Write a protein that binds this ligand. Structure first.
Ligand SMILES: [Cl-]
Ligand SMILES: [Cl-]
Lengths: 95, 78, 103, 97, 97, 83, 105, 93
DNA sequence: GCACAGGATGTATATATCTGACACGTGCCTGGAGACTAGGGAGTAATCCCCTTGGCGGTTAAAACGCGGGGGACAGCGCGTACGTGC
DNA sequence: CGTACGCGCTGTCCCCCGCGTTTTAACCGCCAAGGGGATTACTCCCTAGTCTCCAGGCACGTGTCAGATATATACATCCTGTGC
């Protein structure tokens, strides 16, 4: 019985991080999963062209970054770059 | 078949649409409109099925079609 | 993991796989699955935020598609982002044009 | 007694914008879908989710459309939507030519 | 003396500008504008003269497309004169913001 | 040297000329400012993006290509300048 | 013949279309018929367009195809016009079309 | 340095189709754009089709169905025929 | 009350001329051709079971249809003025 | 500077909305059957990778004619004038 993946459990964990005493329906869960994949493509895609445009073979956090700045509206971009630059530095801390 | 899209159904959609008053000729116009819509979406959909060598049009063919057409839909395996 | 090592809830592994396999480029940096998983995590938070709010406002403990729609269409910045997305079972915001109202 | 022409209209608008349930009953719609697809390929099957997907996409679209239609009506100092509005809406959307 | 009636030179001018392809905004003003806006995003930027020329090509196309659809909105309203509200309806419908 | 009020370079006869190629013949006086309004939101969009490409390419010069890529991005693809 | 173009009896460089599809991250691997097919479809269209442009050039009494000629070509053809329905041609101009209600009676 | 272009192939085809007819620098440029645009559009949508079908390779079957989504009717039909012809031609030779 | 010459208004057009861009020929190099291997993708065939279709009959809401009159569309008119034209 | 259009008013006629009752088929629940899609193991064709080999394709340079420019002239019409 095939082992189909999703983002479901992580959506949940983040839900708890923001609204601890709140739950979700399957129907809305699909929407959250759709949302994630759509956003993932759009950012990944932009990043991809960015590389090409600049005759370079690698999609780095930087490519991802500027992708985000083209894909997102002023404020939402702003925070996104934060969380982005943060988790990266915090990652490069640990090893 | 097409006329299966009932006047009252079309009326409800326009209500959710914010519309107060509806001309008679609208109903039929709506139908051509809706038809064109499905056609294009189902043409693209089927093309995905034809290419997937399946006799069963999936949700993902639909979903891929709506993307193609810039009418992205969430909640059927994005 | 690496979700840990970056304080993320979002699968930093999963993401690194998907970038390599989804044909975006020849090679794929170490920071990017982290940068992106984060941005993904960030944005799913903002939605879950305002939807939950909306479910409180609409007096329910569980979020249904509507609560997402309300959260989205009412947010000026999110609505743009999902400017071309129809959300299943979203409905519409209530909006009735003036001149249509009684006198 | 009798409610003044247009007052249940306003009341109905309120009711439908508050709800998220689909407004075309499934089976006529479903039969319309199969008909249209048959014209593209014979002996075909649809996933029930594949039909819902179409249904959602279509309604959502039509509602959006009435919204924009309705604005054109209003632009013409009118209060009744008419096919000439839809044509203008779509024209400007760049759907129709 | 002599005096062409109102609307007579408009029709002429339309036909003039619909035969040709040469840019309608003056070259220098245009550039000053673009250099401004860009400064206010990041200072210390230079431009390939062809890069300005691109943005202008893209600019006029848009506005002419725009006026086209504005014009339709004027006509929708049994009017012949275009008005900010017309433009405004075109942009709402195009789904611009 | 400082740059100020340049949108008023977009003179009224030009905003006119465009409207004519646009098939409009009768122009309301309140149109000219709305057009400048629009042209601005337009240029602010293409250049925000053009620039983001220029910043990514780590450059101080904005190229015909950064522009063209931006337009493509905004669904206003343009032929004639590379790409 | 050596040129894969000739093997396919095509004007378009099938070697180029092949390199591009790889240096382009569309998939791991590329078939060998896909370049060919694509290189040909590219040709059909440049031909289909150049045809109508030349005719446009001709009516305008001209030896040389300039973008107005491509523009006239494109927006006069229902179908090409839709393929390029979101595209701008530098120096195109627009189609002469004046609305009815603006014409004198 | 080398700036590649479809300038020769476009000339070739123009000469085949309107032999007493030349193209301007700008016109060429435009043409040159059009080829590239339709290249990506096709190539991209083919790439999606490989992906959607858990498939590692873009074969002309992909490039074909890609074409059936991208192009309008008469254009699509002809292009398809034109295409599958040169493949057939290519196999044999 | 209208229409057609009177006139000068702009566009059309004919001309030659002067220019610079295209179109070509030459030669130099890089990207494709050629030939070979080794490896894994995909195609094919062989089994499975899940999902789709189908057909049937009960209440039950929704579609239909008509009736009657109200208010909105639309057409006519007139006023006031803004926008086109010209210098 | 004034003309002809935006719009505000009116006035009529009918096309929609409301509402009560009469007519259809949407829906739900229940079971039944086989199509097709999903999964598995196998072999071989096809494509990536690698090397050596050379003309297709590029830049570079140069010669000329299509087209832009300048100015003269023929063709079209629109509105103002004058008279019956
Ligand atoms: Cl990285
Ligand atoms: Cl192939």
């Amino acid at each position: 019985k095939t082992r189909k993946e999703s983002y479901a459990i992580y959506v949940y964990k983040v839900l708890k991080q923001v609204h601890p005493d709140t739950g979700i329906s399957s129907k809305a869960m699909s929407i959250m999963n759709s949302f994630v994949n759509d956003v993932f493509e759009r950012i990944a895609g932009e990043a991809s062209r960015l590389a090409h445009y600049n005759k370079r073979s690698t999609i780095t956090s930087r490519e991802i970054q500027t992708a985000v700045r083209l894909l997102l509206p002023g404020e939402l971009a702003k925070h996104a770059v934060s969380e982005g630059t943060k988790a990266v530095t915090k990652y490069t801390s640990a090893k | 078949n097409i006329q299966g899209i009932t006047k009252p159904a079309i009326r409800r959609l326009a209500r959710r649409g914010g519309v107060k008053r509806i001309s008679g000729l609208i109903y039929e116009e709506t139908r051509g409109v809706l038809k064109v819509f499905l056609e294009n979406v189902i043409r693209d959909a089927v093309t995905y099925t034809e290419h997937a060598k399946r006799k069963t049009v999936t949700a993902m063919d639909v979903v891929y079609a709506l993307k193609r057409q810039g009418r992205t839909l969430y909640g059927f395996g994005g | 993991t690496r979700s840990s090592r970056a304080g993320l809830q979002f699968p930093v592994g999963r993401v690194h796989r998907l970038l390599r396999k989804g044909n975006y480029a020849e090679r794929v940096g170490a920071g990017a699955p982290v940068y992106l998983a984060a941005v993904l995590e960030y944005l799913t938070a903002e939605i879950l935020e305002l939807a939950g709010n909306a479910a409180r406002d609409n007096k329910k403990t569980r979020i249904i598609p509507r609560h997402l729609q309300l959260a989205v269409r009412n947010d000026e910045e999110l609505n743009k982002l999902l400017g071309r997305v129809t959300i299943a079972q979203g409905g519409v915001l209530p909006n009735i044009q003036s001149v249509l109202l009684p006198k | 007694h009798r409610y003044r022409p247009g007052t249940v209209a306003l009341r109905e608008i309120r009711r439908y914008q508050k709800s998220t349930e689909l407004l075309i009953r499934k089976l006529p719609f479903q039969r319309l879908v199969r008909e249209i697809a048959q014209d593209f390929k014979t002996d075909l099957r649809f996933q029930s989710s594949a039909v819902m997907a179409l249904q959602e996409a279509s309604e959502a679209y039509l509602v959006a459309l009435f919204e924009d239609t309705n604005l054109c009506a209003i632009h013409a100092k009118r209060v009744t939507i008419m096919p000439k509005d839809i044509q203008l809406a779509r024209r400007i959307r760049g759907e129709r030519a």
